[PDB]
Structures are given as C-alpha cells and as structure tokens.
Design a protein around this ligand. Structure first.
Ligand code: HEM
Ligand SMILES: [Cl-]
Length: 393
C-alpha cells in the first residue's frame, strides 16, 4: 500500500533541480518508501508538520541523519540538543534559548546592522561581485564569529566544519565520505574553541559556559553545547541570504516593492527561507509501530522529512514557486516545527533582515552577470557562485 520509488534525494541530479522530483514524491502518496536508501519519505506539508510535532513517536535521539545511532556509531559525539529527545533535550534547549534570546538580540542588532550597511556600500563601490563569496558568505563571517567570541586564529576551519556537519546527515555517498575522511583538523579546531578559556567574555560561547553556574547544564556539557553553535548557523544563513539576493535578482518586481517599503526586509527574508529552504531535509527514527498517511511504519525505521517540498506543497501554499515578500509565511517549516524548531532563528532572521534592509535602501537593481553555479550538499541547498552587478539607488 506504500509506493516504492527509486528517486535518490541525495543525488547530484536531484540537487540540480529537485522540484519535479518533489512533486513526484508528494503526488505518489502521503508516505513513500525510497528503495535507494530503505527509508520512508514524507513530502507533503501536512505529514511533515505532523511528524515534526510528534516527537515521542518520531524521535531524534537515534540521529536526525540517515545513520541510526542504535545501529552505528555517530561520526562525532551526539549534539546535546539536536540529537536529543525530551526530557534530556529540555535543559540545553533552555540555555540556548536564553543565550540567543530576544534580549540578546538587542545587544548585537546595531553591530549586525552596521556591518550589513557597510558591506552593501562596499559592494556598490565594486559593481560585479560574487553574491556568495563577497556577500552571502562575507557578511555572516564578519559578524557571527565575533558574536560567538571566537579568536581570529583558525576561523578558516569554520565553513569547512559546517559543510561537513550537513553532509554527514546524509547517506554514505561520496559527498559524505569525502567530507568525513580527513576531517580531523576541522573537528580539532572546533572542539578546541568550545573550551571556556578560548571564548571571549560577553559572546555566545562564554554565555553558554556561564550557564553552568545555574544547574541547567553541567560544566562538562558546555563545550558540546558551544559546538552546536559552531555547527549550525553559518551555512544555512549563508545559503538563505544568497537565495534572497537570487530571488531579488530573478523577481525584480519584488525588489522594487522592497525598495518602496524597506520594513518588508524581515518578511522578505522569511519568504526566502521558505522559497529556498536552506535546510532541505531532516530524518526522524520511529520509536514504535505508527500509522502515518494510511501506511503502518515499523519500529526503528528512518523517516525522511522533505522540508523544502513541504514549503512548496500546493495543497498548502498558493503559487508556491513564486517569491512573494508579502506572503504570510507563518507555518513554513524551513526552521522546523515543535520542540526542536531552530533555536537560532532570531540570529538568522536578524542577519537576514538587516542585509535585506541594506539592499532595500541602497540598491536599485541586481542583475545576474555571470555563470550561476550550484553548491552541492547532502542536506543544504544553496549556490556556490552568483555573479551580479549592483546598481546604486
Ligand atoms: C536560515 C537559517 C537557518 C535555517 C534554515 C535553520 C534550520 C533549522 C531547522 C530546520 C532546525 C530543526 C531541526 C530538527 O527539527 O531536527 C534547526 C534547529 C536548530 N538550529 Fe537552525 N537554522 C538556521 C539558522 C540557525 C542559526 C543562526 C543558529 C544558531 C545561532 C541555528 C542553530 C540551531 C540549533 C542549535 C538547532 C537545534 C534545535 C533543537 O534541537 O531544539 N540555526 N535549524
Ligand atoms: Cl567536532
């Protein structure tokens, strides 16, 4: 009663144009089996949302990648937050919630906004820039590592470690194996910077250690929690910002709208997160036999949630493939949903908004002026290079 499909959602051919295959996955049925990897898939909005919000049956403590931690050893010690279920998840989640709090956003908003304005003006002096290297990547690298309190030495390891994390959620294909193999220098840099003497006071990493006084986390838990913030955050925001510029380049009406009302910058970024879904997929593992979309799934089965597909499901979204900066994005699952919803979402929206605000106020046109290249990752969708010509306002 369950349709078996041969689509490999982690194949380069898939990454290059996933949307036809995502309609095939949605329309085949509410639950599919992927014979290439022996996992269940859900690609419609309603089932993805249901799985995300049913953590006791669809757990994360057995890994949110293909690998099942009950069967194989994780390639690194499990995240205390992403790879945990309630109640073990609860206290590290509260710490990160507070470290990346609304109140915290007040402390960094002016520095983050200033860097974004400065960068767009710098790029407007240039003309043809790569919207990935020069902007999507350059801007987050100029604000987040400082906000973490990271030292200068070794930052060259930061993007490699992020790309490795998200490749590692994937199946054991060449992308994953290449990433994991000879990754020890990236792991060694990160693990060393998770130690308290290495984190500048007042930054995110030092504030995590300062919570060890409260009884919420123990001193030995703090370095792994800091690791979360050296794992998440950078790559997804990079891809999301690069996607926004791309959409603003491909939908010029929406740039003109945003120019006429820069207070749309925040929803413009949220809509870019829905439209691109920089985090395409996460896994759950079933804790029991469960009925989902009429199919009975056994215990200990991997379930692949297509977040990006769920964000373009026409059963939920009008004109899902159109970028609409006045769309009401509420309910999109590009940040997840339920107990695990992105705890770093205020930092991403902040970086995204202030960059889109900078563009809204200083830029009149964004014209693609060179070969566009995709960046391939088992979990993340984003561009490798986007040559554009910025016309000053
Ligand atoms: C556009 C940017 C981002 C996207 C698309 C994104 C995506 C996601 C998603 C889909 C989840 C839920 C994972 C799951 O349910 O298994 C998640 C959780 C998480 N995110 Fe983000 N994220 C972004 C930015 C950030 C930032 C800026 C940070 C840190 C400052 C961050 C840190 C985390 C952490 C630590 C978790 C684990 C939360 C938990 O398990 O409760 N992310 N992210
Ligand atoms: Cl590590």
């Amino acid at each position: 009663t369950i349709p078996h499909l041969a689509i490999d959602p982690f194949s380069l051919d898939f990454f290059d144009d996933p949307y036809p295959d995502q309609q095939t996955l949605r329309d085949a049925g509410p639950v599919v089996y992927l014979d290439k990897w022996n996992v269940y898939g859900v690609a419609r909005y309603a089932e993805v949302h249901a799985v995300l919000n049913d953590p006791t049956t669809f757990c994360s403590s057995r890994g949110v990648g293909l690998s099942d931690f009950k069967k194989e050893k994780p390639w690194r010690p499990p995240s205390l937050i992403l790879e945990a279920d309630p109640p073990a998840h609860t206290r590290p989640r509260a710490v990160l919630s507070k470290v990346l709090s609304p109140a915290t956003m007040k402390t960094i908003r002016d520095g983050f906004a200033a860097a974004a304005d400065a960068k767009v003006d710098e790029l407007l002096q240039r003309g043809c820039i790569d919207a990935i290297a020069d902007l999507a990547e350059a801007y987050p690298l100029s604000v987040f590592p400082d906000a973490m309190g990271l030292k200068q030495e070794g930052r060259e390891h930061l993007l490699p470690y992020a790309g490795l994390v998200f490749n590692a959620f994937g199946p054991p294909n060449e992308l994953r194996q290449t990433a994991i193999e000879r990754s020890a220098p990236h792991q060694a840099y990160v693990n060393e910077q998770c130690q308290r003497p290495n984190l500048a006071p007042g930054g995110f990493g030092a504030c995590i250690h300062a919570f060890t006084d409260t009884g919420e986390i123990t001193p030995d838990e703090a370095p792994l929690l800091v690791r979360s913030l050296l794992s998440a955050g950078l790559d997804e925001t990079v891809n999301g910002i690069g996607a926004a510029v791309y959409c603003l380049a491909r939908f010029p009406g929406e740039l003109q709208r945003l120019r006429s009302d820069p207070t749309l910058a925040r929803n413009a970024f949220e809509e870019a997160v829905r439209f691109e879904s920089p985090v395409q997929t996460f896994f759950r593992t079933t804790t029991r036999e469960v009925e989902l979309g009429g199919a009975v799934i056994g215990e200990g089965e991997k379930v692949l949630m297509f977040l990006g597909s769920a964000n373009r499901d026409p059963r939920r979204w009008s004109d899902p493939d159109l970028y609409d900066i006045t769309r009401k994005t509420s309910g999109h699952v590009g940040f997840g949903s339920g107990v695990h919803m992105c705890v770093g979402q205020l930092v991403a929206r902040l970086e995204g908004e202030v960059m889109l605000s900078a563009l809204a106020r200083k830029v009149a046109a964004i014209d693609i002026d060179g070969p566009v290249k995709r960046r391939f990752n088992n979990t993340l969708r984003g561009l490798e290079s986007l040559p554009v010509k910025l016309t000053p306002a």
